[PDB]
Structures are given as C-alpha cells and as structure tokens.
C-alpha cells in the first residue's frame with residue numbers, strides 16, 4: 425500500500441481499505457463525531473466501531489458531517505455478546521443501522537466467539553448478507569478452533585477475522601491458518617493500547633527512519649498484510665498514524681519487531697471470555 | 700415489606716428500597732425517561748441502571764422529570780468491565796454522574812469480577828465512598844470466592860451483591876454466605892427475562908392467588924429477603940409488577956417454587972466470563 429485509499433480484496437471482491445480508525449473507549453457524541461470527521465477529512469476511508477462502544481450515533485454523524493459520499497466509505501460494526509442468537513442478532517443489526525443512520529454496513533462482525541451461540545449468530549449474518557444489508561461478513565476474536573467449527577456448517581466463509589495483533593502478540597498460528605483460508609486478518613489494539621511506544625527495540629528503528637514508534641508498528645502491520653485500525657481522539661495523532669506510505673521497514677527491522685513476541689495480551693482471550 | 704416505599708438497611712445503615720426498576724435493554728431517551736417516571740409516578744423509589752446499558756441520560760432525565768426529591772430516590776449504577784482499574788473506575792464513575800445529572804450515587808457496583816482487576820477497582824469504589832460521592836458500595840455477579848478474596852484486603856465490605864436469581868437459579872449457598880456476612884443480596888433478571896412466566900407450577904400458584912406468575916415470582920424474591928428489580932418498558936407491567944403487597948405465599952408455595960431450581964442461567968456465569 426502506497427496511500428490511505430489502498431485496498432485489500434476480500435474473498436467476495438469487496439475492497440476493504442488497508443487502514444482505519446477504531447473508536448473504542450471513545451465517548452458518544454462529539455469526541456466520536458469529531459474523531460470520525462478529522463480522520464475522514466484527512467483521508468481515512470475506514471471506521472471500526474461496535475454496538476458495545478456506545479458511539480454509533482456520533483460515528484454516524486461524523487460520517488455525514490464528513491463530506492464524503494457514503495459509498496467511498498467502509499463502515500464496520502459488531503454484534504455484541506449479549507445479543508447472540510438468530511433473532512436477537514437480526515434485531516441487534518437493525519439497531520446498529522438506525523443509530524448509524526446507514527441503510528447498509530460494509531462489514532459486520534461477531535464480537536466474540538464465546539461458547540454456544542456463535543453458529544446461530546453466523547446464520548443470522550449470512551441471511552443479512554443475502555438480503556443485501558451487509559457487503560462483507562466476518563468474525564472477531566476467533567481462534568483456529570472456532571473457525572474450524574464455524575466452517576462445518578457455514579454457508580459463507582468469514583471474510584475478516586479481527587483479532588488483537590501487535591509486536592507482543594504476533595498471531596503466527598492464526599495468521600497462517602487465516603491466509604490459507606482466504607480469511608483476512610485485521611489488527612485490533614494494533615498499538616497495544618499505547619503500551620509499546622517506549623519499547624527500546626522499536627524506538628531505535630523509529631529513530632533510524634525519522635518516525636514515531638507508532639508509525640513503525642503501523643508500517644509493520646502493512647508489510648505483514650494485516651488490515652489495521654489504530655485509535656486516537658487527537659487529530660495530530662490520527663494524521664501521525666496515517667503518515668507511513670513514505671518509508672519501508674527492511675526484512676532486518678521486520679524480524680526484530682517479530683522477536684518482540686511474548687504471545688501477550690492486553691485484552692481478553694476469546695478462549696476465556698465465555699458467555 | 701408492606702408497600703413500595705419499604706426498605707432494607709444495609710450494613711452502613713443506608714436504606715435501600717426492597718423493590719426497583721431495572722432498565723437493561725431499555726432505549727436511551729424517550730423509552731428510558733418514560734419508563735423511569737411511570738415507575739416513579741407509581742411509587743417506585745429504586746432504579747437500577749449501568750454505564751453499559753447506555754440509557755443513563757434518559758434515566759437521569761426521567762428522574763428530574765418525575766419531580767421527586769433526589770433524596771427520596773435510590774439510583775444504582777455499575778462500572779463496566781472495560782473500565783476496571785483504579786484510575787479508570789474513578790473516571791468511569793464521573794461519566795455516570797455527569798450523564799445521570801447526579802451529585803452522588805446511592806449505590807455503585809462492580810458489574811462483573813472477571814479475572815484480574817476487581818480488587819483495585821474496589822479500592823476506587825472505596826475512595827469515592829470516602830469522598831462521599833457514593834452512599835453505598837457493592838458488587839455484582841460475585842461468587843463466594845471473589846468475596847473471600849475481596850475481603851482479604853478491603854477497608855469496606857460490600858454492602859450489596861447483585862446476582863442472577865430466580866426459581867431456576869436459587870443461589871442457595873451464596874445467600875447463606877451473604878446473609879452471614881451482612882451482604883444484601885439483590886436479584887437481577889428476576890423473571891428470568893420472561894422465561895418462566897409460563898411455568899406450570901408457578902401458574903397454579905398464581906391462579907390460586909389471583910395474581911400473575913410475574914407477581915408470584917416477585918413476592919417470592921421478597922419473602923426470601925432479596926431486593927428485586929424487575930424490568931418492563933410497559934407502564935401496566937410496571938404497575939402490575941409492584942402490586943405484590945396484598946397477598947402472601949405460604950411455606951408450601953415457597954418450597955414448591957424453590958424446587959424448580961436447576962442451577963440454570965439466562966446470563967453469563969461469573970466464573971466463566973473472564974476478562
């Protein structure tokens with residue numbers, strides 16, 4: 425990828441922008457509205473939200489007050505754990521549309537696997553897909569197991585798997601499984617919620633390039649072929665974060681970053697989050 | 700208790716109405732606002748919401764629109780999982796106050812224990828309690844061990860433990876432990892989210908008494924000395940639900956209902972939901 429507009433093709437030929445804005449822990453109304461606006465105005469073409477983020481309304485208002493045609497925009501949201509099941513997901517989806525002021529979503533993800541209800545929730549996604557309400561359907565926080573089990577009974581293969589991904593948790597096993605299945609990986613907490621931006625191995629590599637630690641990580645994502653969705657509520661970081669198409673990491677750098685892995689999570693394990 | 704006004708004394712001498720409005724899955728603004736003031740217009744003096752419900756603004760609005768004195772109302776909210784940690788709990792609590800339009804909460808709860816972050820989530824509750832911004836502090840979906848564990852380092856013991864409780868799930872053990880610890884049990888999902896309203900055994904007992912199953916269940920919560928907070932978005936259900944003070948269940952009835960128990964949940968198990 426050479427710019428912000430750049431796209432990855434999903435197994436159904438839907439072009440998902442390689443880069444995005446996540447809006448988790450961002451507050452409803454103006455914070456979310458302004459962040460969405462600032463990102464779009466600076467060229468982001470991809471927003472990632474969730475029902476549980478509480479901010480679909482402010483995101484939906486950013487989109488509109490943004491000034492870019494809806495169809496040039498790729499909007500994602502997720503069904504929450506509590507609405508899992510066939511009928512309750514259908515209904516959960518429509519509430520997301522209505523808060524978002526959208527007629528369709530570009531991606532809709534199951535938030536978490538959990539225990540029992542995700543196969544029926546998938547059936548619900550598939551139907552919305554067929555009804556033409558969602559352009560792409562996918563999954564979030566799924567292990568190779570869940571995916572194996574999903575696939576027994578799926579009519580549509582998931583297009584995206586959005587998992588926590590960063591130097592500290594590099595997802596080697598799931599990456600190989602997912603690329604072999606034409607399921608695109610997407611990185612959540614790509615910045616490890618900020619916890620890596622003092623990392624000395626990363627700061628030496630940022631130094632060399634004249635870049636921030638956040639940029640390096642973000643470029644590392646791109647060179648591994650993982651869609652990314654960093655979050656910020658500060659406009660200069662939103663710009664700082666997209667400013668990565670003017671340098672590359674060498675194989676040398678890439679492996680060093682990879683040598684940071686502790687298989688280490690700052691958010692829930694999908695195998696421990698059971699409802 | 701003999702009326703809607705009736706209260707239980709928590710171990711710090713705070714008086715919590717036995718009966719409340721639960722507001723889970725009720726929509727922000729008009730729906731919330733209207734639910735609340737229909738309840739208050741009919742004598743309810745306790746409302747239970749949470750940060751993660753995201754009707755806290757419509758609740759606060761309905762509180763003020765009802766016209767009743769702050770001091771006569773009992774408002775409960777909860778710190779969500781995503782925001783546990785000492786600093787984030789203080790912050791998350793100021794957010795609940797702000798959008799509730801309250802100066803203090805009557806009760807603030809740890810929503811779920813999870814895995815790691817509850818003990819110092821608690822330190823944050825305690826601090827706010829000493830700053831006199833919360834009249835009572837407590838906990839939700841804690842098991843005997845979470846509580847043993849909390850108590851090893853607490854300066855203040857939980858005054859309320861809010862857990863899922865209904866004939867399918869009669870929380871026998873946990874009730875003995877809280878009773879002995881001076882920790883007030885409170886029932887969430889009291890009607891099992893509507894699942895039992897059609898139960899055969901509760902039906903013959905309702906019929907005999909000239910009440911609905913929902914009332915029978917509700918009277919059963921009280922005769923067990925559990926605070927209860929049924930949810931309805933329908934003003935007639937709200938009124939019905941509180942109309943439980945003019946009849947009583949015998950020892951036969953109580954034991955019959957009790958015998959329903961299947962250790963059966965409609966919501967997550969606290970021991971499984973591991974964030």
Ligand SMILES: NC(=O)C1=CN([C@@H]2O[C@H](COP(=O)(O)OP(=O)(O)OC[C@H]3O[C@@H](n4cnc5c(N)ncnc54)[C@H](OP(=O)(O)O)[C@@H]3O)[C@@H](O)[C@H]2O)C=CC1
Pocket residue numbers: 445446447448449472473535564565586587611612613614615616617618621636638639653654655656657658661662664665691
């Ligand atoms: N599918 C799922 O279950 C999950 C999905 N996600 C998705 O992933 C997205 C991003 O992950 P997220 O958890 O938000 O965290 P990130 O890893 O992207 O990091 C965000 C934190 O780092 C800071 N930060 C961002 N940019 C910079 C910068 N360049 N320099 C210094 N600090 C910076 C931010 O502060 P500040 O805002 O002040 O700038 C913020 O506090 C979420 O918004 C969400 O959409 C996240 C968790 C789970």
Ligand SMILES: NC(=O)C1=CN([C@@H]2O[C@H](COP(=O)(O)OP(=O)(O)OC[C@H]3O[C@@H](n4cnc5c(N)ncnc54)[C@H](OP(=O)(O)O)[C@@H]3O)[C@@H](O)[C@H]2O)C=CC1
Pocket residue numbers: 720721722723724747748810839840861886887888889890891892893896911913928929930931932933936937939940966
């Ligand atoms: N701490 C925690 O994790 C949790 C806390 N809670 C709290 O407890 C409260 C209880 O709500 P919840 O537990 O979800 O639901 P309940 O067990 O109170 O029952 C809610 C369901 O019963 C329905 N209902 C159907 N018929 C009747 C009737 N005949 N009379 C009265 N109600 C009827 C309501 O429909 P309708 O509204 O359309 O009338 C709704 O679908 C919550 O609202 C929340 O405050 C809930 C869950 C977890």
